[PDB]
């Protein structure tokens, strides 16, 4: 049966919630003497709708805070449904919330039970009201293979936003970004960083003309329109852009494959450059320096790293193999 209740809210609605966004919100307990209780609301009921607000797809934290926020004395309309069987499963298997987020700020654990994260990490949040304590989300760190690694406590959206704001003071990125696994329907653009990135592109554009292509820098600016045409011909666009341009490309949902060619040493770059492009007059010391600064400050943007060996051009084979290996991977994308 499906039941509809109307009552005035006292100091509280006299309720305790279980479940969450994955399985629905559930009455885990009523209070013996309460307007809600007398209205017929009982343990095991799934709260389908409160006032006009949909409750079938709401995180438990949102549900708790919504019902809290309701004004003392005013009226409340609850649509509910008895689900003793579904509720039994939810309690016994202890499931409630389930969704994935991608972080966009650095966080150091504040308790031994907490998870630290860099920018760009993905988490499955499984409990948004961890231990019945507002503020803590229970999350499982998702690895490169998309399997679940370890679990632990991270801050909730609200505190995360606060922490992410104190950190900043171009990306419009929220502290947590809702993400889901998707397959690429297009050959996504390639950007290569590293002391021989310029050489990498030229060899890729040359030896593999039908798989790759270079997006031209017009009077320097590379615009989106040039990239779109390379995609529409079924090729990867090779992009000589900035870290910040990569960030903007991720936000705009183009999620480029980003390869970093990690140099072995300053003197190693010189030897590689002398072999691969003696014609170039670019400084190896400056290229190496920029490479270190880049890795130091923007490693969260990399999707793969290849460790250069200065006496060995096996990086090119590795690069082609890596670029494809990536394309075949699924991507965490916005909602």
């Amino acid at each position: 049966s499906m039941k509809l209740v109307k009552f005035r809210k006292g100091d509280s609605v006299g309720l305790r919630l279980a479940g969450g966004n994955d399985v629905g919100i559930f009455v885990a307990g009523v209070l013996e003497d309460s307007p809600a209780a007398k209205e017929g609301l009982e343990e095991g009921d799934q709260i389908l709708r409160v006032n006009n607000v949909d409750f079938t797809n709401i995180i438990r934290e949102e549900a708790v805070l919504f019902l809290l926020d309701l004004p003392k004395g005013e009226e409340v309309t609850i649509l509910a449904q008895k689900k003793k069987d579904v509720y039994r499963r939810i309690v016994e298997s202890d499931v409630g919330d389930s969704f994935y987020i991608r972080t966009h700020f650095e966080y150091e654990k504040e308790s031994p039970y907490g998870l630290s994260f860099n920018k760009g990490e993905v988490f499955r949040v499984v409990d948004t009201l961890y231990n019945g304590k507002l503020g803590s989300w229970l999350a499982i760190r998702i690895g490169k293979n998309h399997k679940e690694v370890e679990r632990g406590i991270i801050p909730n959206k609200n505190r995360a936003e606060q922490l992410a704001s104190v950190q900043y003071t171009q990306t419009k990125f929220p502290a947590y970004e809702r993400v889901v696994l998707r397959e690429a329907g297009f050959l996504r653009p390639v950007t290569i960083f590293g002391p021989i990135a310029d050489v990498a592109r030229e060899k890729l554009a040359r030896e593999e003309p039908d798989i790759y292509q270079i997006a031209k820098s017009e009077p320097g600016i590379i615009r989106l329109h040039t990239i779109k045409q390379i995609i529409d011909q079924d090729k990867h666009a090779l992009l000589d852009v900035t870290p910040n341009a990569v960030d903007r490309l991720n936000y705009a949902q183009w999620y480029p494959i980003v390869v970093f060619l990690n140099p072995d040493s300053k003197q190693g770059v010189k030897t590689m450059r002398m072999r691969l492009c003696p014609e170039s007059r670019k400084s190896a010391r400056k290229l190496y320096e920029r490479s270190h600064k880049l890795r130091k400050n923007n490693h969260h943007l990399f999707t793969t790293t290849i460790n250069l060996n200065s006496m060995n051009d096996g990086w090119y084979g590795a690069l082609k193999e890596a670029i494809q290996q990536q394309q075949n991977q699924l991507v965490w994308v916005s909602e």
């Binding site: 509280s12 006299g14 919630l17 307990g29 809290l68 019945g132 304590k133």
Partner: peptide, 7 residues
């Protein structure tokens, strides 16, 4: 025995 949150 987690600390319940009643609203």
């Amino acid at each position: 025995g987690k600390t319940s949150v009643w609203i």
